[PDB]
Amino acid sequence: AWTPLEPKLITRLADTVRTKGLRSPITMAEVEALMSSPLLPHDVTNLMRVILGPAPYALWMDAWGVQLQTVIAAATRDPRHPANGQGRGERTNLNRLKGLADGMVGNPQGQAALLRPGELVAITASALQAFREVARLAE
Amino acid sequence: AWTPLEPKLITRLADTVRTKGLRSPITMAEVEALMSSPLLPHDVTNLMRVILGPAPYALWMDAWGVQLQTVIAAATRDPRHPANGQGRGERTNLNRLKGLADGMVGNPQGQAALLRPGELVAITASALQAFREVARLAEPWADIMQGPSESFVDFANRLIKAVEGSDLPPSARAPVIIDCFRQKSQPDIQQLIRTAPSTLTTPGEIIKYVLDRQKTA
Amino acid sequence: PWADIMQGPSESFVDFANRLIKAVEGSDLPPSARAPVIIDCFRQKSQPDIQQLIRTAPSTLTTPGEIIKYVLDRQKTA
Amino acid sequence: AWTPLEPKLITRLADTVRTKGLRSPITMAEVEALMSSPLLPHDVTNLMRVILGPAPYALWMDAWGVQLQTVIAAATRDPRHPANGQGRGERTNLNRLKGLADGMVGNPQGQAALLRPGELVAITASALQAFREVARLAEPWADIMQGPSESFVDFANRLIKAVEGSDLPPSARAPVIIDCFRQKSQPDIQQLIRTAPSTLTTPGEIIKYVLDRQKTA
Amino acid sequence: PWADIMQGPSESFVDFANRLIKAVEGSDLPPSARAPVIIDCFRQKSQPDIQQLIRTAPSTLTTPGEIIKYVLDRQKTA
Amino acid sequence: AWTPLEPKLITRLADTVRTKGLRSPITMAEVEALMSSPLLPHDVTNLMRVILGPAPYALWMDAWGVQLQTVIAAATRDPRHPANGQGRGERTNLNRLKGLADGMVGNPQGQAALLRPGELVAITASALQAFREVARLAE
Amino acid sequence: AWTPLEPKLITRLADTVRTKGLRSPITMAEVEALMSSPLLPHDVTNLMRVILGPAPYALWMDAWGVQLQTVIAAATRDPRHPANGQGRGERTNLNRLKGLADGMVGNPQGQAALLRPGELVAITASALQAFREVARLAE
Amino acid sequence: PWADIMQGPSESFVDFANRLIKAVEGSDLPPSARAPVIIDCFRQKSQPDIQQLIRTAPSTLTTPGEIIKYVLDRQKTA
Amino acid sequence: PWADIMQGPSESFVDFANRLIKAVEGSDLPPSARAPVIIDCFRQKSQPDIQQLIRTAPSTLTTPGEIIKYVLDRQKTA
Amino acid sequence: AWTPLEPKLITRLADTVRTKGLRSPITMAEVEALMSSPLLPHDVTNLMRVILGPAPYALWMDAWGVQLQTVIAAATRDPRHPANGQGRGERTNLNRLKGLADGMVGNPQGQAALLRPGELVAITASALQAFREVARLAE
């Protein structure tokens, strides 16, 4: 069952990003805090939509896609990925990682249903690395 | 039984509207949050009275009336409305939607008594759409230039904001943002984008490239 | 005092409308005299650009909300 | 048997390119007209030598080579090309397409002898696409303003020309033209469009409305 | 002469309309040609502020009286 | 039998309108005075032709037509109008009110013959209201 | 069988429109000349694309649509239109007039196949009236 | 004379390239010396804005067509 | 002191590079920290024309010699 | 046995480079003179360290590396290089050309011991071409 993040925590994090900036160690610590439980693509996408401005959000979408593509290359380079399965029918496509696959587009409940925990942690680590890249790039 | 919304949440939402404005995505998210349970006309009316100023409140009353009238036209166009009933005696008049009907004027308890859940959700959706209209109305992309002293991320933020919060179709925002990056964004960055050995086909890619190769100053 | 409210040279129109409606509704006027006063104050205050914008209205505006909507539509973006 | 194109038609086409330019729709129509029958490499080469200046001719040679190389890649990707044959001995090399193969260099009769009709039509389509590329390259919408003394039909002509002859998708031209009519087109016409009792949702409708209610001066 | 009548830079509109209607009705035109001439003289004379005011009329004005009423309503008070 | 209004009274009223204007209470009182007996369309038309300038006269013709049209709408909304009759053959057309009907065009005697007293008082009240509108509009 | 108009005549007409303008009587005579035989929607559309600038072409598309809509209203007001038939299965839709119907989009040969001569003359008269409107409007 | 050709202050670049290629190919140079001369004349003529535009080319341009394409891409729209 | 070295407004780039490399190699830095410091001093000193020239390098320059070669190739002849 | 170049000749060559520059034909002739006998990597490296400034020395190191890499590509393209041998055990690596191989780093005697005469002449020609490139580049 999907539970959304508190809008109070999200508002506090947005104001933190607004006053301290993207690169302060306190901001990265707060992001790591709100990046503790494995989030669904819907959660991370809306979180970055709210805390980041328009141009940093575009940059972050780009960087997140690139990092997820690196993850999928490593996944096709190793059939023992915690997102993959043993047979070929469990291979994870980027539509399933970005939340674009069938039964997931716009629906967080179905998303949480079909996604694997390894998928969730890989998406989360990818999003964190992308946030780091964009923060280092913006300023 | 009617339970009022917390004045603490209402005060926080009012201050959010006061600092961030009516159109910020955080404000719309907060309104969607306080618009979660189906509200009675009394609740939404007092909520908009408190969070909105006088002139936006007048505009919102107008827009809410218009949207409720569209709803009632659709209701008389379909006898299977969740606010309607099967017989003609359950047809829902605008006095019952705006809370003006008999046994409802000024009394939220009686309101909650006589109203249907379909009535409540229709009123709530109408009020949300009216709030969106008024927010879009209360507060030009083709006039945006990068100032001589302005940084590029500020210019990109301002431009993307003005382009996405405008009347363009959703499928026309990215090409417009790109072509505005290319023609605005004073000639140093113009030449920096022009002499791109790779083809940049996304605002994010253009922003990344410019941030990499920009003249540190 | 409502009759002393003017739209400043740099003030936007929604702020002026908010201030004016506040001062008119929080005053000693009868309830049935607020809308005509708000309209006639929109027409005579609200510095001559908006005055001419309201004057040359092909439609007849008979409500403060309608005047506000019209002015917000056709206002000089600046 | 090879028959040359009339020098009268070629002279008329050259003067058309000289007065109207490379990108006018009348010029492209005339080129399509003289590109009706499948031409031999000699014909197209001499035609572009005559109608184009030196620098556009260099650009066109480059673009024609690139397009022919794409064609030959598609040909090696499909043995059923109308220029190819079934066996490997009919595979078509770029020397045969550009007219550089044995028995063809400088001789149009031998050229017409050895060439295939599929070869001819592929060469012709390649040359047409290369001409389009060079024409788009040889000669900004977001910088167009209506001058203080300029009429509105001239401004609309210039703006529609620059918007349709640009890199925008076809589905993004009308909204951009409308929003440029609204934000450019100096504040008298801006206010004239703003105070439109009807909603104008097409550049033609906006042009008609403005032409009706414009300030005669 | 009616075709030489212009609205002066400082003249009001009712004086200009009076002068023009006087000169048009007291002339050699047929009776069935006075109203169209008066209208088309209101549109082309009557210095460009009122010209643009008549041009941007959301309704179609088909009578000198209607044009006079419209202009008197929406005129720039000065 | 039709009796014309005195040109002396009309000249005095015209000079009153010329010096005091259209909107002064003395002018409206004088108009009410000369609007005492029910006038035929000929009388009111010539009166407004003489006392009003050309442009106010055009405005007044417009306003008089509009008010007479409102009167005729009320008349078709009530068959008991003092201008109407009981049967449908007495319904009053605008040609009969404006003096344009058959046997009335340009002839005040025939006008006075065919017109009803209710017709006369309705025409008179309409003309007075139109004069008020034009006076409020001119200045 | 469809035969295109000569590009020489079209070039001469375009230069006539360029030097004399849209409203000169010589230009209207030349347009009437090139509007002699009933043209297919493809022909008139390309002709106006070539001879008219971008903004006059937009205006002309609007006016042509309006005039064709008036024609279709008259057609549904009279089942004896030379474009219509006797039964309801021959009723002519605007997709068939503007060349947007099935089997006609972009293909002039199929266009000439399915279209009626009454359809062609109605389209032609509509286009001529639209050209007149736009010419009167542009200058 | 090819060695006397300069790009005028108001002249576009395609006109200058046309004139230069015409004068170089219609001259007494050997056929194998036209391309290097055209390139080195693009670099030293073609007033200093385009000179600096060609100088700061991240890629090496080794053909008049490539230089023309690059300059047409990155030229200062004016 | 290496951290106080700036390229003068009139100084050429090879003189500035010579002075900077001299002061960096004849200082108290470890041997493994000279190349990164020389690069980052080329990027932040070396007045903004050369700063932008190095910034907009389509290739990644990872050595002082490569930076010097690139700048000498694409420098503004003056 | 390794014999160093005279510091008197090196001082004269350094002053020649200082007064005449890098590109003068007299300077290139002097370099060709001091480039007569096949030099060990130590000799050429110290020579360029002394006669060239810091920035030209960096440029020259770059160019020398590139030219030596071209030489090693030609060497792997032909097993009959005077630096190579017949078997695969005599293939010459860039560590042996730049003097970085085992038993050579910093020791000119061991360098002269293990190096081949073909190796020496290839290194020398590479260094001369690199000097020419840097001289053409510096001014």
From Swiss-Prot, chains A, F, G, J:
Q: What segment(s) does the record annotate as region Involved in capsid protein dimerization?
A: 42-50, 103-114
* Localization (cell): Virion
Task: Spell out the subunit comment.
Answer: Homodimer. Homomultimer. Homohexamer.
Q: Main role?
A: Self-associates to form the irregular polyhedron core composed of hexamers and pentamers, that encapsulates the genomic RNA-nucleocapsid complex. Assembles as a tube in vitro. Binds to inositol hexakisphosphate (IP6), which allows the assembly of the polyhedral capsid.
Name this protein carries in UniProt: Capsid protein p27, alternate cleaved 1
